[PDB]
């Protein structure tokens, strides 16, 4: 009831032993009470790293999108080593969403090792059961065996109606996913924990299908975009193995479901000027001359037997001497081009001088072997060249035309496929013009390039008119390596030129704050050259690919020096030092911020010979290479862009939390108030708040003004209320609950952004017997639910929303202002829910959590706190606080990564992914949050390190003085594999 505080553990340790004499009763009582719950102390257990590998195939569904709805692929297992380590070998196959599938190596929800399951964005299936939302659900299958060598998992994705179906060795499984969110792009994905050899089979040459694709399901190989080659890659990597060493990699420029939709500019509404009749006539005549000339130049040389037969299609010279239908077909030719010009902002003009007379109106070849052969090309390229601005306008017009063509085809029902197939209405050039291959781009602008330059020759006046906090990734040295004296030198190679700021940052560095924008960093951005301490300052010059910066700090002289390829980057004033005066402060750390699609090499200098250009700059100037004698590679910390709930700081310059006491006719409530509302620099954005302690539902779901004590002692309905202070509009309030894996920092949030998936178990006949639902947050829509009213929009009532939760039945009913809202939820057994509210501030006082009770209702303090399980007095213990969803948090990069070998074995043999060498980490599970971290990550989390050390001493004290019974009890918690790993662990 007061948080993890180590003096209480010290008190317990004092209880264990008195002046070298063990109190057996106290030791046994402590071991009997604190330990079996496994809910207060930080549990630790040896877990195994899990790596996810995907194909680059992305398939999605959107309104008007080109992407096909039904897709299908296979995974052929060829080798599994069950229990290579002490833990079972993880192996799952399924789909996953590009929007929120972030399987960072090490740590994660639950006990870690997240794969194709373990979150609501990705859905998987091992041999026995499927996996989503970190919930395992047995599904009936004929073999009913875990994924073993020689097993073909055939996975089908239906997007028209949401469904992910599985087929194990031909016979389908009896249960599938359904009714999930379709935002983002789906991709095949296999997750494994070493000892795994799998073979991707995507149809066609990229893996021949062992079993037939279900009718109407296209092979997955058909969705590889024309600009990319099919290959197997990890989902999200912050590191890579390049020839010089570990290459740090920034975020990815991942596509979206709305990227595949075509969006053109309307041209029919555009009116046509008299320049139409003035110029478009001769322009269309030039286009006819173009077609005629290309056919006269062999291939389609015309013959008089028929006007437009095979290969003799040109007819009636270069003039539009055609009957009225074909005449209009030739007339509107440049007219539609004029419409696209006036829609995209190009301006129609006229030949003020004798531009047309200067144009010779006769092709230089002048072969004209036939009367139709006559082709009067004006040599418009010869007279007026094509400006690059004009070429970019040609590209925009081609993009508009191709996009409206894509719209025409998708209205007709033409999806995209890499293999060209007319009766299936699938083409390989049907993607939007941005994702078009360059050959098709040239094919589309073949005539436009000339048409536009002929517009110029006729004297025209034509002229030229992702997610926030995931933009960059910051890698910094560990805070245990803060240099406070001396002269140091660390290098950074720029493999991809871009926004990859590099420098020295203080140990207290904000992860979400851009590197160098605040005083906590001193960096150099080589994209344009500018240095950053408090802002951009012109310095040095931009780098190139392969350029290395030998960043230097002299803490004796209080200077920082950047240099590029051994040549010191001079400042604008002319001095070599970028920062002439820096305070030592609390130290400095090698830091870098890579942008999206950026690759760097942060070479600290473990090997001085590997450190290039150091003899030129740094050696014999008195610069020790940073981290030179340190035998282990320096552990780095990357700004993990995964939203995570952290307690609201008391020093937050925009929000404050008030612990208002109980008093009478009022429950204990936690008020949230905007500190700087209605003033300059007022941060008005979506706020995700939860209570730090969760309520856990009754495990076995049993059927199950004066207050009645018997009913309050037998009841399992524990709830509270949320009071929305007057001034905060109800349209931006979301009262409800969150599961402990809610990780959505969506600035534009509503109930349609809520993660959800219905897992449906049916039998062999197909009849449904289970329709379980999964969601990461169960909140009534305050954003749409409120009392009506013509005036008094700032109503005097606070819209008190009570959150009736039965732990036994599972009924999550919501009430508002004394009336029962129609919204009600029903969740599975063994679910932890945090009382959470999402609000957009609109007033000085916005909302508060009223932790109280009602008639025959027992308070939420009973729900979270076991000591007050039968106490009807509402309470606010110091543990129960308000936590806000942080966007970015620092995470330690693992010392070693699972080496996965992927290669295209053959046409039959498909793709081959093999992981053999095992890797394990000692996880630390936070029992009330259902999240695990690396126990090596505690080197910077000194708040948890002290508590865990005191927990170790408490164990060592309860097993003290020959208490072998408690020693056995301790072996269950801290086992000898964990002990031996801690013995051999160096970091």
């Amino acid at each position: 009831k007061h948080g993890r505080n180590h003096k209480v553990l010290d008190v317990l340790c004092s209880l264990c032993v008195c002046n070298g004499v063990a109190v057996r009763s106290n030791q046994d009582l402590i071991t009997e009470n604190l330990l079996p719950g496994r809910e207060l102390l930080l549990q630790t257990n040896l877990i195994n790293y899990v790596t996810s590998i995907r194909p680059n195939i992305f398939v999605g569904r959107a309104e008007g999108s080109t992407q096909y709805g039904k897709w299908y692929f296979e995974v052929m297992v060829d080798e599994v080593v069950p229990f290579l380590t002490a833990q079972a070998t993880h192996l799952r196959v399924g789909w996953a969403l590009t929007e929120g599938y972030s399987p960072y190596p090490g740590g994660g929800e639950g006990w870690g090792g997240n794969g194709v399951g373990d979150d609501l964005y990705s859905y998987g299936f091992d041999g026995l059961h499927l996996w989503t939302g970190h919930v395992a659900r047995p599904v009936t299958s004929p073999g009913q065996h875990l994924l073993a060598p020689e097993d073909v998992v055939s996975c089908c994705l239906d997007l028209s109606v949401p469904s992910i179906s599985f087929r194990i060795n031909g016979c389908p499984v009896q249960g599938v996913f359904e009714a999930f969110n379709l935002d983002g792009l789906f991709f095949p994905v296999v997750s494994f924990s070493a000892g795994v050899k799998v073979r991707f089979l995507l149809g066609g040459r990229h893996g021949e299908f062992k079993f037939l694709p279900p009718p109407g399901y296209a092979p997955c190989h058909e969705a590889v975009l024309p600009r990319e080659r099919l290959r197997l890659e990890p989902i999200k990597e912050y590191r890579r193995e390049g020839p010089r060493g570990p290459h740090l990699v920034g975020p990815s420029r991942c596509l979206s479901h709305t990227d595949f939709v075509p969006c053109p500019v309307d041209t029919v509404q555009i009116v046509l000027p008299p320049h139409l009749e003035r110029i478009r006539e001769k322009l269309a005549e030039n286009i006819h001359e173009l077609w005629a000339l290309t056919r006269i130049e062999q291939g389609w040389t015309y013959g008089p037997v028929r006007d437009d037969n095979k290969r003799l299609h040109p007819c009636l010279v270069n003039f539009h001497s055609l009957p009225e239908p074909e005449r209009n077909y030739n007339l509107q030719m440049s007219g539609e081009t004029l419409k696209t010009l006036l829609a995209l902002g190009c301006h129609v003009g006229m030949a003020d001088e004798k531009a047309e007379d200067n144009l010779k109106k006769t092709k230089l070849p002048k072969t004209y072997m036939m009367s139709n052969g006559y082709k009067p090309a004006p040599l418009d390229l010869s007279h007026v060249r094509l400006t690059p601005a004009q070429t970019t306008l040609v590209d925009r017009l081609a993009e508009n035309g191709h996009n409206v063509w894509a719209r025409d085809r998708v209205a007709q029902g033409w999806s995209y496929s890499a293999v060209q197939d007319i009766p299936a209405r699938r083409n390989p050039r049907l993607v939007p013009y941005r994702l078009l291959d360059e050959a098709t781009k040239r094919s589309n602008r073949d005539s436009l390039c000339q048409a536009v330059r002929t517009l110029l020759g006729y004297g025209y006046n034509i002229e030229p008119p992702q997610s926030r906090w995931d933009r960059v990734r910051i890698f910094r040295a560990e805070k245990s390596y803060t240099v406070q004296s001396g002269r140091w030198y660390f290098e950074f190679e720029a493999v991809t030129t871009g926004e990859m700021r590099v420098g020295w940052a203080r140990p207290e560095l904000r992860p979400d704050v851009e590197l160098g924008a605040d005083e906590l960093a001193y960096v150099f951005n080589g994209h344009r050259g500018q240095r950053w301490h408090l802002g951009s300052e012109p310095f040095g010059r931009p780098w190139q690919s392969g350029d290395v910066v030998g960043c230097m700090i002299d803490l004796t002289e209080n200077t920082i020096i950047f240099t590029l390829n051994g040549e010191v980057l001079m400042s604008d004033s002319g001095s070599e030092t970028a920062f002439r005066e820096i305070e030592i402060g609390d130290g400095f750390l090698p830091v870098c911020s890579l942008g999206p699609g950026q690759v760097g090499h942060l070479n600290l200098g473990q090997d001085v010979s590997s450190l290039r250009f150091f003899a030129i700059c740094g050696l014999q100037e008195g610069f020790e290479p940073f981290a030179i004698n340190m035998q282990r590679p320096v552990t780095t910390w990357f700004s993990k862009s995964l939203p995570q709930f952290e307690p609201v700081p008391p020093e937050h310059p925009h929000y404050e939390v008030a612990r208002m006491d109980g008093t009478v006719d009022t429950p204990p409530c936690l008020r949230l108030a905007h500190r700087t509302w209605g003033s300059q620099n007022s941060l008005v954005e979506m706020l995700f708040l939860r209570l730090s302690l969760p309520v856990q539902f009754h495990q076995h779901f049993r059927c199950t003004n004066r207050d009645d004590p018997e009913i309050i002692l037998n009841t399992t309905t524990y709830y509270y209320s949320v009071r929305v202070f007057a001034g905060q509009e109800p349209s931006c309030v979301w009262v409800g609950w969150v599961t402990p894996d809610y990780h959505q920092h969506d600035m534009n949030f509503d109930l349609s952004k809520v993660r959800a998936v219905t897992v449906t178990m049916g039998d062999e006949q197909g009849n449904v017997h289970s329709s379980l639902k999964c969601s990461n947050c169960y909140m009534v829509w305050g954003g749409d639910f409120v009392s009506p009213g013509q005036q008094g929009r700032i109503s005097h009532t606070d819209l008190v929303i009570g959150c009736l939760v039965d732990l036994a039945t599972g009924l999550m009913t919501f009430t508002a202002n004394g009336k029962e809202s129609n919204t009600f939820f029903q969740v599975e057994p063994n679910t932890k829910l945090f009382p959470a509210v999402f609000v957009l501030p609109t007033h000085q006082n916005v909302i508060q959590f009223e932790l109280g009770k009602q008639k025959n209702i027992m308070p939420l303090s009973a729900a979270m706190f076991l000591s007050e399980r039968k106490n009807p007095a509402p309470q606010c213990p110091p543990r129960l606080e308000v936590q806000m969803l942080m966007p970015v948090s620092w995470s330690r990069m693992p010392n070693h990564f699972l080496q996965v070998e992927t290669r295209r074995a053959g046409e039959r043999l498909g793709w081959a992914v093999q992981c053999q060498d095992p890797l394990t980490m000692m996880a630390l599970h936070i029992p009330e949050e259902n999240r695990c971290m690396d126990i090596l990550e505690l080197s910077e989390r000194l708040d948890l390190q002290r508590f865990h050390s005191h927990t170790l001493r408490l164990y060592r004290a309860v097993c003290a003085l020959g208490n072998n019974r408690v020693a056995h009890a301790l072996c269950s918690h801290v086992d000898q594999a964990q002990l031996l790993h801690a013995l051999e662990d160096a970091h």
Partner: nanobody, 126 residues
Framework: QVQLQESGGGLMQAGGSLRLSCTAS????????MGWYRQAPGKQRELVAT???????NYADSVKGRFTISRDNAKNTVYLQMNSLKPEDTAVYYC?????????????????????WGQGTQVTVS
């Protein structure tokens, strides 16, 4: 948008006159040539004469019979008349309202791809 309502084709002996009717209802452009594009069992879709909006005949690869295609432009109902049925005409017939009249294309490639396909009617030949 441009939907090609394609009426069924009767079954009748070789050498029998049959009129195939199809209406390309939609945008008033890129419908000038409503020639059929009949796809044979196991073979590539052969091209029937794509007459212009003024019913200008052209040579096609499937002109072994008459293939007298007369589109009534009063209601944009292409009437491919087939007086001489043959063992080639036993195919699934597909009216095509494409932009290029008689295959004549002084335009660009996206424009050439402005072809609206038909429903399809198997006109078997006895």
């Amino acid at each position: 948008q441009v939907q090609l309502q394609e009426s069924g084709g009767g079954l009748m002996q070789a050498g029998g006159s049959l009129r195939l009717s199809c209406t390309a209802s939609g945008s008033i452009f890129s419908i000038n040539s409503m020639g059929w594009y009949r796809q044979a069992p196991g073979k590539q879709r052969e091209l029937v004469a794509t007459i212009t909006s003024g019913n200008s005949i052209n040579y096609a690869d499937s002109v072994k019979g008459r293939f007298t295609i007369s589109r009534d432009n009063a209601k944009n109902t292409v009437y491919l008349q087939m007086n001489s049925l043959k063992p080639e005409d036993t195919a699934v017939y597909y009216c095509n309202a494409d932009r290029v009249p008689n295959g004549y294309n002084p335009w660009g490639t996206p424009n050439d791809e402005y072809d609206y396909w038909g429903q399809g009617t198997q006109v078997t030949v006895s």
